[PDB]
Amino acid sequence: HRIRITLTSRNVKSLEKVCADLIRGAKEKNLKVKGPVRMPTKTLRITTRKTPCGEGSKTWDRFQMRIHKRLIDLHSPSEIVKQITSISIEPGVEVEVTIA
Amino acid sequence: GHQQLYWSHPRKFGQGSRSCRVCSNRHGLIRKYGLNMCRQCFRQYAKDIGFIKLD
């Protein structure tokens, strides 16, 4: 089966740690696994005035929100995919599994 | 006819049809990404949402 697992999160270190854990499980289970494909990141920019009133020098704030997304493919039945995704998950990392 | 003339004016559009979800003020709304706040409440609540200053 063509099984695709999508991981999208905000932090980068916990995302890399859980991706390393998943690829380590795929390597120790001895099955064909695609590499960690790194999609381009998206930034959410909101620019707003600092002062609440209309007095002062025209100073502005710059907010950002980096979003990192990975996807790793597998060749296995579904129960292996669920039992390998439901092990040692991180709170700040979303996991999302579909089959084509 | 007060039951029909209480809210007979349409509010399908305009800036009076929008409101902040914190203080309900119809000025300086942030309609990007569906925050739907004013700018002051956004600066108050920006850190715990995930928006940080790096640039």
């Binding site: 905000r10 997304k69 | 569906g34 925050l35 609540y45 715990d48 995930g50």
Partner: peptide, 19 residues
């Protein structure tokens, strides 16, 4: 789910919910 809003709006709604 038929609606399934975008990845930006998901993190936005999650942040609004936590706030």
């Amino acid at each position: 789910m038929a609606v399934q809003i975008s990845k930006k709006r998901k993190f936005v709604a999650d942040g609004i919910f936590k706030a």
